[PDB]
Structures are given as C-alpha cells and as structure tokens.
Amino acid sequence: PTPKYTFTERAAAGNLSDAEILNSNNPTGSELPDESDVVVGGAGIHGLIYALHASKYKPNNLKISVIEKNTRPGYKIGESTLPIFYTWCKLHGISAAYLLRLFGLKDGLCFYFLDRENQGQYTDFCSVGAPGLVLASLQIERPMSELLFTILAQRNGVNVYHGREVDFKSTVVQGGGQGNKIAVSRGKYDSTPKTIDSALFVDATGRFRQFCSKKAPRHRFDGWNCNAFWGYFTAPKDESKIPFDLYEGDATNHLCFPEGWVWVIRLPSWEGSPIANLMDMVTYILECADAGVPGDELPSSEELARMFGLKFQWVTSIGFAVRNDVKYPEDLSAYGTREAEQKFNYFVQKYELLQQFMSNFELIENLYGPGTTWFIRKTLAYQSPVVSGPGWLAIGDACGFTNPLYSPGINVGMSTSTWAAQLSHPIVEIGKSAPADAAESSIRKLLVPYDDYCKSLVPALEQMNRFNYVCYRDTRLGPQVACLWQFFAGIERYLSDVNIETFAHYAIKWVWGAMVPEYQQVAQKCIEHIETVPLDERLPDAMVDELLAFSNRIKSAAVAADDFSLRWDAILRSFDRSLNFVEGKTSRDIYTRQCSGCGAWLQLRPDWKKCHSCGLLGTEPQTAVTFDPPLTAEEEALLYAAWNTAPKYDPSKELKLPTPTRPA
Ligand SMILES: Cc1cc2nc3c(=O)[nH]c(=O)nc-3n(C[C@H](O)[C@H](O)[C@H](O)COP(=O)(O)OP(=O)(O)OC[C@H]3O[C@@H](n4cnc5c(N)ncnc54)[C@H](O)[C@@H]3O)c2cc1C
Ligand SMILES: CC1(C)c2[nH]c3ccccc3c2C[C@@]23CN4CCC[C@]4(C[C@@H]12)C(=O)N3
Ligand SMILES: CC1(C)c2[nH]c3ccccc3c2C[C@@]23CN4CCC[C@]4(C[C@@H]12)C(=O)N3
Ligand SMILES: [Cl-]
Ligand SMILES: [Zn+2]
Numbered sequence: 098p099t100p101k102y103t104f105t106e107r108a109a110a111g112n113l114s115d116a117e118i119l120n121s122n123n124p125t126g127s128e129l130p131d132e133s134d135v136v137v138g139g140a141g142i143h144g145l146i147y148a149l150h151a152s153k154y155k156p157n158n159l160k161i162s163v164i165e166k167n168t169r170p171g172y173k174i175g176e177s178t179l180p181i182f183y184t185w186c187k188l189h190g191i192s193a194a195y196l197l198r199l200f201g202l203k204d205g206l207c208f209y210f211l212d213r214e215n216q217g218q219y220t221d222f223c224s225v226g227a228p229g230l231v232l233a234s235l236q237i238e239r240p241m242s243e244l245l246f247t248i249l250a251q252r253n254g255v256n257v258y259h260g261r262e263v264d265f266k267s268t269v270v271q272g273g274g275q276g277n278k279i280a281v282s283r284g285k286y287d288s289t290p291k292t293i294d295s296a297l298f299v300d301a302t303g304r305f306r307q308f309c310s311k312k313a314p315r316h317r318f319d320g321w322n323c324n325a326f327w328g329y330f331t332a333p334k335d336e337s338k339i340p341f342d343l344y345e346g347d348a349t350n351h352l353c354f355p356e357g358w359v360w361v362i363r364l365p366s367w368e369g370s371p372i373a374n375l376m377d378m379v380t381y382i383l384e385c386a387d388a389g390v391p392g393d394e395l396p397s398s399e400e401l402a403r404m405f406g407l408k409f410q411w412v413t414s415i416g417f418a419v420r421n422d423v424k425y426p427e428d429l430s431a432y433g434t435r436e437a438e439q440k441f442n443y444f445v446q447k448y449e450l451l452q453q454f455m456s457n458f459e460l461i462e463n464l465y466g467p468g469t470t471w472f473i474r475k476t477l478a479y480q481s482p483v484v485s486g487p488g489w490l491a492i493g494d495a496c497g498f499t500n501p502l503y504s505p506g507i508n509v510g511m512s513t514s515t516w517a518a519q520l521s522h523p524i525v526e527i528g529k530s531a532p533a534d535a536a537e538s539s540i541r542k543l544l545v546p547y548d549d550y551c552k553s554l555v556p557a558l559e560q561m562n563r564f565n566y567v568c569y570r571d572t573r574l575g576p577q578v579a580c581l582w583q584f585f586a587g588i589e590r591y592l593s594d595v596n597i598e599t600f601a602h603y604a605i606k607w608v609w610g611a612m613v614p615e616y617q618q619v620a621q622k623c624i625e626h627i628e629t630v631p632l633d634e635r636l637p638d639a640m641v642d643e644l645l646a647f648s649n650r651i652k653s654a655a656v657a658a659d660d661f662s663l664r665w666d667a668i669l670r671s672f673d674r675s676l677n678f679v680e681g682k683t684s685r686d687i688y689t690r691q692c693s694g695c696g697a698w699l700q701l702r703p704d705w706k707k708c709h710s711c712g713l714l715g716t717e718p719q720t721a722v723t724f725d726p727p728l729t730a731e732e733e734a735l736l737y738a739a740w741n742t743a744p745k746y747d748p749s750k751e752l753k754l755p756t757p758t759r760p761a
Contacts, residue, residue, distance in 0.1 A: 098384045100404055101377065108373035115169040116260025118373045122248065123256040129281055130256065132294040133162040134525050136279045137301050138263040138308065140165030141173065142239065142507055143493025143514040144301030145246035146185070148255045151518035153189055153597055158522055161255045162293060163301075164281055166262040169372045170243035172465040174327065174472065175501070176362050176414055177203065177349045178235045179508040180227070180589055181604060185515070188597050188743060189249070193233035193700065194392035195382050197709045198401060199245060201236035201364035202698045204689045206503070207348040209341050209450075210575040213355050214635050216449045222576035223343065223670035224584060225686050228722050229700030230737040236349070236364035236414075240465075241375075248379045264290055265307050270298050272487020272537040274528045296488070296525045299517065303494035306481055313482035316497075318559050320628070323357065323500055326437040326473040327416025329465075330458035332363050334696030340453040343670075346413075347689055347698030349504070353569040354448060355632060357419030360501055363698070365398060365710070368464055369408035378405040392705045397712035399695070411696065413458060417444055418501050420566065421476065422632060437473035478562070480555040484513075485544045487537050492517045497555035500562040503583060503609055509558065512604035516547060519601045550605055561611040564620035567627035571636045574623065576671065577678050578648040582619055584669065585652070585676060586610025590661045591753035593739050598746040607755045615655040619648045652676060658760040667725060687723035690715075 108118040120127040135151070137144045140163045148161050186196060204226035212218035226234055247257045264280035267290070271277065275296040282290035300308040306315065336346050344350070350361035367375065378401050385395055402409040417440070425440065432442035445451045462470050480497035484490060492514045498506060523543065528536045561583070568579035587610030595603045610616055623644050630636055656676050666674045670685040689698050697710035701722045707714045724733065744750075 098381065098388055098390070100381045102405070103380070104373040104376040105371070105405070108371075113373075114260070115372045116258075118376065119169060119247065119257070119259045122251045122376065123258070124251060124254055125256050129258060129261070129291045129293060130160070130162060131292075132160075132275075133256075134159040134295060135161045135297045135299060135521055136263075136277065136293050136295045137161065137163040137299040138279075139163075139301035139303060139495075140167075140170070140243060140247060140257055140259070141301060141303050141493065142175075142242060142246065143303075143495075143510060144299070145243060145250055145257070146511050147299060147301060147492050147514040147518045148250050148257075149189060149246060149253065150185075150515045150597075150600070151521050152250070152253045152255055154519050155522050157254065159525055162295075163250070163255065163257045164261050164263050164279075165257065165259045166284075168260040170240040170247065170259075172469065173239035173243075174325075174416075174474075175239060175504075175506050176236050176364055177360070177501075177504045178237055179504055180232055180234055180592060181607065182508050182511065183232050183234055184592055184595055184743075185511065185600060187232070188595070188600065191245075191249070191383070191386050193229070194390075194395060194705070194709070195386045196235055197233065197700075198382060198395065198398050199241050199365075199379075200238070201362075202347050202689065202700060203234035203236050203349060204345065204698065204700075205348040206351070207345065208351040208353055208576060208580055210569060210572040211352065211354040211448050211450050212572050213448070218572065219341065219450055220572040220576055221341065221343070221671075222580040223685065224348075225668050225670075226688055228686075228688050228737070229702035229705060231740045233700060236362050238364055238366055241367050244372075244375055245379055248376060249383060252383065263302075263307065265311070268298075270308070270488040272540070273533055274536070277488050296528050297521060298489040299521075300489060300491035300495045301493055301514075304479070304498060306491075306495050308489060309481045309483055309491045309495055312486060316480045316482050317476075318478055318480070318556070320563070321420045321422045323418050323477045324421050324473070324475045325416055325418045325477060325501065326441045326471065327360075327414065328437075328441060328471050329366075329461045330413045330415050331461065332411035332413045332696065333457055334691075336457075336691075339457055340450055343683075345689070345698075346691070351502070352451060352454065353575055355570040356423050356444075357417060357566065358502065358569060359451065360414065360416050360418070362414040364412060364414060365697075366410050366412045366464065367407060368410075370402075371406070374405045374407055378407060381405070392709060393707050395709070397708065398697075398710045400712055412461060412464065415455075415458065416472075416501070417441060418477070419444070420632065424633070433471075435471050435473075437471035440473070441471065478559055481551075484551045485548055487540070490517055490520075490544065490547070496551045499555065499558040502562055502565055503587075505558050505561075505609060509554075509607070509609055512601065512607065513547075513551060513554075516550075516601040516605055520544065520547060554608065557608060557611040560617065560620055560624070561609060563624050567624055570627060570630075571641050573641055573645060574636075577645060578619065578623065581652070581672070581676065581678075582616050582648065583610065585656065585659075586613035586616040586757065588663070588755070590755045590757070592755065594744055594753055596743045596746050599752055602752055603755065606752075610756060613756050615651050619651055622647055654760065655757060659757040661758065664726070684725045686725060690719055
C-alpha cells in the first residue's frame with residue numbers, strides 16, 4: 098500500500114484543532130448525532146475495547162458513540178499488557194508484526210527480590226513469553242494505544258468524539274425504551290450543550306466513576322492500601338551494567354522488597370508528534386494489516402517516523418507501588434521539591450541495589466508536557482458497589498481497581514469491557530421489543546451475573562495483591578510461593594482456542610487465577626501469618642520455613658491434578674517440569690534478542706530478518722529460537738500450527754477454562 102497523508106493535509110488545509118481532525122474521521126461526521134443506541138462516557142482503553150468488541154461481536158446492530166473529554170488521546174499510566182490482550186488484538190485483525198511498530202516487545206514477567214536487612218543480597222524469578230510464531234505481549238504508550246483503537250473503531254462504524262465532555266449534572270439516565278438523554282458539552286464554560294437520545298449509557302470514566310459514584314459511595318478494603326510515584330527515563334542500549342544477573346529489558350521487571358515493588362517497562366514513545374500525522378501513520382499501519390504485508394516488507398518504527406514526520410524515542414517507565422503504612426521522615430527536601438520526586442528518590446537510596454540499578458538511567462523531563470516529570474497517586478485500591486442499573490452499566494476502572502502488579506487493570510479489566518459489549522446487544526433489543534416494565538425487569542435479570550462477577554472480582558484481585566506483597570517481604574517466599582502460585586494458577590490454558598464469540602466467557606473465567614481454590618488457600622495462610630509481623634521487622638526464619646513447606650505441600654497435589662501439558666522447565670528458569678524449585682537452575686527457552694543497532698528487543702522467527710524498530714538486518718541465524726529442553730522439528734511445527742489462526746465459532750464446543758484441572 099502506498100502511504101497517504103490524508104489527515105496531515107486535511108488538518109493543514111482547514112487549520113483544524115486536534116479534536117477536529119480526529120472527529121473528522123467519524124463515520125457519521127464530526128458533529129454529535131442526535132441519537133445513538135449506546136453512548137460511552139470516556140475513550141480510555143476500556144471504553145474503546147468495549148466499543149470495538151461490541152461492533153465486532155455483532156456488526157451493524159448498535160449505533161455507538163464514544164465521548165472523550167481529552168482533545169486527543171491523553172497520557173495514562175498502565176503500559177504492560179498480557180497474552181489475552183494480544184489475542185484480543187489479533188482477533189480484531191492486528192497481529193504482532195503491526196503492533197510492534199507502535200509498541201514495545203514484552204517477553205516475560207521477571208522479579209528481583211531485594212533483602213532489606215542484608216543490603217546487596219537478592220533472589221529472582223524469571224519467566225519467558227512465547228516464540229514469535231506463537232504470540233507476543235506488548236508494552237504500550239497509552240496515547241498511542243488509544244489512538245490505534247480510536248481509528249480502528251472509526252473504521253468499524255463507531256463514532257469517537259474527542260474534546261467533548263459528558264455533563265453528568267444534566268444527563269438523564271433511565272430504564273425506558275430509549276430513556277437516556279446524554280448531555281455533551283465542550284466543558285463547564287460551554288453555552289450550547291448537545292443531547293444524544295439513546296438507550297444505554299456505559300460509564301467508562303475510569304477511577305473518576307463519574308456516573309456510578311452517583312449510585313453508591315466508593316468502597317475501600319480493610320487494611321493498608323498503596324501509593325504510587327513514578328517517572329520516565331532513558332532506555333540504555335547496553336543493559337550489561339544493570340546490577341541484576343541475567344536481566345532482560347523486554348521483560349516487565351519487578352524490583353520487590355518489604356515495602357512494595359518497582360516496575361520497569363521499556364517502551365517506545367511517540368511524544369511530540371502532531372496528532373494528524375499520527376492518524377496517517379496509524380491508518381497506514383491498519384491498511385498494511387488489512388493487506389497482509391509481511392514483517393520484513395513493513396517499514397520500521399523509525400522509518401514510519403521519517404515517512405509521517407513523527408517523533409520517536411525509547412523510554413523506560415519506572416515507578417514505585419508501595420504500602421501506605423510506610424513511615425517517611427518528616428523532612429524530605431534533600432531529595433527534591435515535589436512530593437512524588439522526594440519519595441521516589443528517598444526510596445531509591447534506601448536500597449543499594451535500587452540506587453545501582455537507577456544509575457543506569459537518566460531522568461527525562463516533562464515527557465508528557467509540563468508538570469509530568471513526576472507522578473504521584475495515593476490510595477490506589479477501591480471498588481464500585483453498583484455497576485449497573487436501568488439504562489446504564491460501568492466497565493473498566495469504573496468498576497474498581499487494585500494495583501499495577503501483574504497488570505490486572507487492562508488485562509483482567511477487559512473481561513468486564515468485553516462481557517458488557519456482548520451483553521449490550523440483547524439489552525438494547527430487549528428495550529426496543531418489550532413494554533417498559535418487563536424490559537427493565539428482564540434486563541436487570543440479565544445483568545445479575547455481571548453485577549455478581551464484578552462484586553467478587555475486585556476482592557479476589559485485592560487478596561491476590563496482598564498475597565504477593567506480603568511474600569515480597571522475604572527472598573524465598575516471593576519467588577517460590579507467591580510468584581509460583583500466580584503463574585501456575587493464572588497461566589492461560591487453552592488460549593489458542595479463544596475466538597470473538599468465546600472471548601468474554603473465557604476472560605471472566607481467568608482472573609489471573611485468583612479464584613483458584615488452592616491459590617486462595619496458600620494466599621490466606623501467608624497473609625494471616627505475615628500481617629502479624631510489623632512492616633519494619635524481618636520475617637522470622639521459622640515463619641518462612643513453615644509457609645514454604647505449606648505452599649509446597651498444597652502445590653504438589655494441585656500440579657499433579659492439572660491435565661494441561663506444559664514445558665514448565667522451559668518457561669520458568671528456576672523450576673523443573675513438576676514446578677519443583679531448582680536451586681541454581683539457569684536453563685530456559687530463548688525467544689528474543691536485542692538489536693545490535695538500536696537496542697530494541699526483537700522476536701526470533703525465520704521470516705523476520707530485519708529489526709522492526711530501525712530496519713537493521715540481522716545476519717539470519719540469529720532468528721533461531723532456543724528450545725531448552727529441545728523440541729524436534731515436528732514438535733516445533735506442531736506448536737506454531739496451533740497458534741496460526743483462531744478456531745471458527747462452534748456453538749456446540751464446550752469452553753475449555755484457563756485455570757488448572759480440578760482434582761475430582
Ligand atoms: C501506578 C499505576 C500503574 C499501573 N500499571 C498498569 C499496567 O502495567 N498494566 C495494566 O494493565 N494496568 C495498569 N494500571 C491500571 C490501569 O492504569 C487502568 O486499569 C486503566 O488505565 C483503566 O482504563 P479505563 O479505560 O478504565 O479508564 P481511563 O484510561 O482512566 O480512561 C477514563 C477516561 O474517561 C474520560 N472522562 C472522564 N470524565 C469524562 C466526562 N465527563 N466526559 C467524557 N470523558 C470523560 C477521561 O478523559 C479518560 O480518558 C496501573 C494503574 C496505576 C495507578
Ligand atoms: C500460555 C502462554 C500465553 C503463557 N502465559 C504465561 C504466563 C506467565 C508466564 C509464562 C506464560 C506463557 C508462556 C507460553 C506457554 N505456552 C507453551 C505453548 C504455547 C505457549 C503460550 C504462552 C508459549 O509458547 N509460551
Ligand atoms: C455455559 C453457559 C451456561 C454459559 N455460562 C456463561 C457465563 C458467562 C457468560 C456466558 C456464559 C454461557 C453461555 C453458554 C456457553 N456454552 C456454549 C455451549 C453451551 C453454552 C452454555 C452456556 C451456550 O450455549 N451458551
Ligand atoms: Cl505484567
Ligand atoms: Zn534496530
């Protein structure tokens with residue numbers, strides 16, 4: 098496909114603002130429709146996942162308008178995504194060769210556990226991702242992911258309006274046939290607000306809970322909560338001076354210690370690029386995805402920047418997520434002038450390994466505009482008690498949220514977005530096909546499982562978060578209990594069977610494994626013990642021994658009962674095939690490599706000979722995956738065959754669950 102510069106030229110020809118060039122790509126036009134079936138408040142990642150999944154699940158049925166107050170896709174924290182998210186992107190027609198032009202490659206979740214009382218001592222937990230011919234995971238810059246999903250939505254009959262705000266004071270939501278009158282303005286100053294007559298409102302306003310807060314007070318869990326403070330840094334090409342053995346920049350790296358943990362995410366940034374130019378680049382990438390352009394014939398990320406006049410740079414996202422019962426000294430003025438800056442730099446110098454690690458990185462000033470060198474957010478975890486009602490439902494952060502750890506926010510949260518999308522078709526049809534009282538009653542019944550799922554989802558994720566946090570107080574419990582149980586319970590069994598039709602049903606059965614009974618049994622034993630030890634104390638060695646022995650005894654039976662075949666010793670560097678801990682084990686599969694030219698991490702596969710980020714040619718043999726233990730040519734061929742394309746929808750197929758087999 099020859100690249101077109103439609104939006105760059107349209108914007109210049111009409112001196113269009115950012116919101117106007119974006120809204121000009123809507124199927125029904127740049128102005129709001131008088132009426133719609135569904136109105137989505139908020140075009141964060143979940144409002145757009147919802148709208149894309151709804152139109153894809155059943156096209157040409159619902160008229161959907163998404164209202165976003167930002168003039169263009171705004172900055173969001175929340176950058177690490179997981180295989181279920183990639184699978185969803187692939188099911189929606191965008192596979193890894195195209196996503197990797199926009200986003201960073203992610204291969205594995207890796208953990209380093211720092212000993213607080215013995216500074217310099219650490220242990221680790223290493224996992225891998227998948228071969229390039231199986232799948233990829235992604236580190237996403239959220240202004241870019243939200244642009245990608247906006248453009249894809251506009252190409253699939255969804256209208257997205259940036260620079261427009263739902264007025265939750267004058268908006269009317271009710272359970273009639275189309276009882277909703279959604280008031281949309283450009284802001285509080287706006288003299289001339291518009292109204293969209295509609296049947297269903299979707300609250301996708303994230304943690305702001307702009308609608309559902311009207312129906313119930315925000316709920317907090319017992320015990321400590323967390324605070325986060327973070328910034329953006331350079332991304333070194335040469336990672337060899339990182340003070341952790343066997344470190345890899347394309348993993349989502351976790352530096353873990355008694356008070357909490359640090360995330361480390363390497364990802365490309367498009368900041369500084371005009372929005373219209375970005376629309377042309379994204380549009381071009383979708384046309385290439387439609388045409389099936391091979392990876393080696395697709396322009397590299399840097400070449401796309403040259404073609405469309407973009408800014409491109411590699412950054413590392415680095416942040417603290419710590420407990421809010423941490424004691425800080427009163428005067429922190431030595432570590433900066435902002436609180437976020439102060440607590441970040443104060444915490445770095447509490448751990449020699451964190452200071453040696455951070456000395457590989459240079460702080461980036463104001464990457465997302467003024468005031469954005471440093472971020473802080475306090476009291477992270479919450480739940481919305483009411484997530485649906487006559488004429489409306491809520492999705493994503495609007496339902497609740499826990500913690501960055503294991504990235505439930507996007508990858509678990511999309512279970513609500515995609516289920517709500519599927520449920521939206523009968524909700525709207527019920528209201529168009531039955532009198533008001535019976536329609537309302539039938540819809541309420543239909544949503545009882547949605548309400549019940551949300552109600553128990555967040556507490557399960559909250560217990561999962563505490564489970565990991567308390568085990569991060571010890572360098573054996575963290576890797577051998579908490580991480581082990583999260584990967585065994587939460588690995589995505591039978592993901593290669595998921596299609597558009599089964600996606601929501603599969604996704605709500607996953608929950609990162611946090612519903613698995615044996616997982617909850619080990620988690621409750623650890624939390625019950627460790628929470629009785631004050632944070633500023635070391636765990637007694639006998640408590641670690643006992644929790645470790647308890648966890649391993651429950652583990653052996655639960656692993657024996659799993660009928661899913663997995664080369665566990667290839668995926669977890671520290672464990673054998675039966676998930677026994679192996680002191681000093683170093684062998685694992687190798688799926689990625691670092692470009693010698695630009696430093697970008699690449700997926701190994703024979704048809705990708707050039708770096709997807711800068712275009713530099715690898716010598717060819719580098720593209721050979723290392724399977725350890727080995728796979729024959731037949732086994733390797735069989736693996737890739739399973740992951741080529743998703744199975745067609747069979748309404749007589751039983752859904753195979755991601756969680757381990759029950760013990761009968
Ligand atoms: C420190 C931290 C780290 C995290 N790391 C990760 C991670 O690595 N991986 C992960 O998956 N998750 C992570 N999360 C969670 C993740 O950030 C969220 O789950 C995710 O962004 C939720 O997206 P959303 O679409 O629900 O809401 P948001 O992305 O917050 O979008 C809400 C939207 O609503 C719009 N809006 C608000 N009011 C109005 C109105 N009146 N009219 C119109 N529009 C409106 C806003 O402009 C905004 O765009 C992290 C969270 C935190 C706090
Ligand atoms: C299931 C999968 C998405 C996964 N989910 C994880 C969670 C935590 C840590 C590691 C993983 C992995 C690695 C896996 C294991 N599978 C072996 C055959 C196909 C596949 C898919 C992939 C593979 O190639 N790598
Ligand atoms: C299992 C089932 C009760 C179910 N449980 C859910 C939970 C959340 C969201 C959706 C579902 C569904 C829809 C299902 C999926 N199954 C495919 C084969 C038979 C069946 C039974 C039924 C079917 O026809 N529809
Ligand atoms: Cl993650
Ligand atoms: Zn390169």
